[PDB]
Every structure is written in structure tokens, then in C-alpha cells.
């Protein structure tokens, strides 16, 4: 709500493009969202759907988190997703990514207040 909803939006949201067809997306994005900062994560998923669209999921199909469970919700249909996948070997500022584009469904956890997604569980 104050750091979680921001945390999620930081990592997973990109509602400015309907998609992403190129490794350029991933490389710029990870950098942009300073996701390479200090230590760039191996793999990250960006949702190309309006933030509202994503919040909406908080009141869709109720599932089981890959941990505790419910408070986990699954997207009815298919979401425009972009997968960012590390590539460039070495453990330093050397971070390159490949841009894989899918159309999968999302599993999100939601801290309502109104509703705000805070943790992006599995991407299908």
C-alpha cells in the first residue's frame, strides 16, 4: 500500500505499451526500473496491462499462492506479459536480458484497502 503496491508496480508493471518485441525492451526496462541496481535479478515478468486491469484481478479467480495461499487471485483470461531473462554470464554490472513475450495468466496477491496487488506469484 505504501511500499508493497509500489514494489509491485516497480517490478512488474508497464502499462505504456501493449507489448514488447525485442531484447531492447528488457535491457532498458531492467535498467530503468533500476532492477539491475546492485544485483540484477535473473528473471522478471512485466505486465503490459493497465494497472486497473491488474488490480481487478484481486477480485477474480481465488487461488492458492505458491506459499500460504489465497489472498491469491488468478486473472480470468490472458494478460500481455513480457518475460525478461538474464544472459551474459558473469556476476557484476554485466547484465543482459532476452525479451520473451507471452500471453499468460497471472496469479497475484492482494492487500486490499481498496485493493492493491503487492506480490506477483507465478505467471501461470
What would you give as the CATH superfamily?
Ribonuclease A-like domain
Name of the CATH first level? Alpha Beta
Q: Could you name the CATH topology?
A: P-30 Protein
Strand order of the largest sheet: 2-3-6-7
What is the 3D form?
A: globular
Count of structural domains: 1
- Based on helices, strands and strand pairing, what is the structural class? alpha+beta
Q: Provide a count of the helices.
A: 3
Largest sheet: 4 strands, antiparallel
What's the β-strand tally?
7
**Helical percentage:** 10-25%
C-alpha Rg, in Å?
14 Å
Q: Judging by the overall fold, what is the CATH architecture? A: Roll
Order of helices and strands: HHEHEEEEEE
Strand percent estimate: 25-35%
Terminal CA distance: 24 Å
Short key terms for the protein model shown above:
124 residues, alpha+beta, four-stranded antiparallel beta sheet, three-stranded antiparallel beta sheet, 28% strand, globular, glycation, secreted, endonuclease
Amino acid at each position: 500500500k505504501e511500499t508493497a503496491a509500489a514494489k509491485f508496480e516497480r517490478q512488474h508493471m508497464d502499462s505504456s505499451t501493449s507489448a514488447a518485441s525485442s531484447s531492447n525492451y528488457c535491457n532498458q526496462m531492467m535498467k530503468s526500473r533500476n532492477l539491475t541496481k546492485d544485483r540484477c535479478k535473473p528473471v522478471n515478468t512485466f505486465v503490459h496491462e493497465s494497472l486497473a486491469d491488474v488490480q481487478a484481478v484481486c477480485s477474480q479467480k481465488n487461488v492458492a499462492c505458491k506459499n500460504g495461499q489465497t489472498n491469491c487471485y488468478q486473472s480470468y483470461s490472458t494478460m500481455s506479459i513480457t518475460d525478461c531473462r538474464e544472459t551474459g554470464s558473469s556476476k557484476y554490472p554485466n547484465c543482459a536480458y532476452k525479451t520473451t513475450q507471452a500471453n499468460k495468466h497471472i496469479i497475484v496477491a492482494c492487500e486490499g484497502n481498496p485493493y492493491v496487488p503487492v506480490h506477483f506469484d507465478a505467471s501461470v
